[PDB]
């Protein structure tokens, strides 16, 4: 077990699933373009919301910008590539008491996979 | 403060497009089903006037798959019917937006949104 608490509040908690390549240079920084794959689910369900394997096309983002939801951003901020882990977001960190459309209520807790694949300037 | 035609994308009135700049001419000049699309944004609550989301902020434009309901369905929409260089503003009643659940701390439930789009180019 590895489980990264990425945040003091315990709202960012990221388990290693498999360790990336751990070097200083392997690791993205603010303003790269990133390009992971991912599955989110809801914590309450266990259901997926939003899978970009599922779509069969790779995500990308730019760090560190607020393109992404917090959690994202200080989740990827730590990865190294190649990188898998699993993901627990607070809702804080996620999108807070208000939810987000159809798939994701209120308050809710999301879990994400993220693969980091590579990332560029 | 020109006087503007405004352009209805829906039957219900929640889709309208106000062109700020006309876009190049013709059909090569439209982006098609399927497309990646590069577009500059700037999204407002109608009812506050807060800025929730800019891409020209970040200075990074924003890229996506046209027609694949992987962008708010007003989006699909208003860049169906934009061209190359357009620069538009349009107008979503929620149905069309984030619905009754809304966006995050800084789109309610029920939210009419206004987007500022300009469609900077597009390939297959």
């Given at each position: 077990?590895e489980?990264?608490?990425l945040?003091?509040?315990?709202?960012?908690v990221?388990?290693?699933?498999?360790?990336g390549?751990?070097?200083?240079?392997?690791a993205?920084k603010?303003?790269?373009?990133?390009?992971?794959?991912?599955v989110?689910?809801?914590?309450?369900?266990?259901?997926?919301?939003?899978?970009?394997?599922?779509?069969?096309?790779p995500?990308?983002?730019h760090?560190?910008?607020?393109e992404?939801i917090?959690?994202?951003?200080?989740c990827?901020?730590?990865?190294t590539?190649?990188?898998?882990?699993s993901?627990?977001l607070?809702?804080?960190?996620?999108?807070?008491?208000?939810?987000?459309?159809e798939?994701?209520?209120?308050n809710?807790?999301?879990i994400?996979?993220?693969?980091?694949?590579?990332f560029?300037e």
């Amino acid at each position: 077990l590895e489980q990264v608490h990425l945040t003091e509040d315990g709202g960012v908690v990221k388990t290693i699933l498999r360790k990336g390549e751990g070097g200083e240079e392997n690791a993205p920084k603010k303003g790269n373009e990133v390009t992971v794959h991912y599955v989110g689910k809801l914590e309450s369900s266990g259901k997926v919301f939003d899978s970009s394997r599922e779509r069969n096309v790779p995500f990308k983002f730019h760090l560190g910008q607020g393109e992404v939801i917090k959690g994202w951003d200080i989740c990827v901020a730590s990865m190294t590539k190649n990188e898998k882990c699993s993901v627990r977001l607070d809702s804080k960190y996620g999108y807070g008491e208000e939810g987000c459309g159809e798939s994701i209520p209120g308050n809710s807790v999301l879990i994400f996979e993220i693969e980091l694949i590579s990332f560029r300037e």
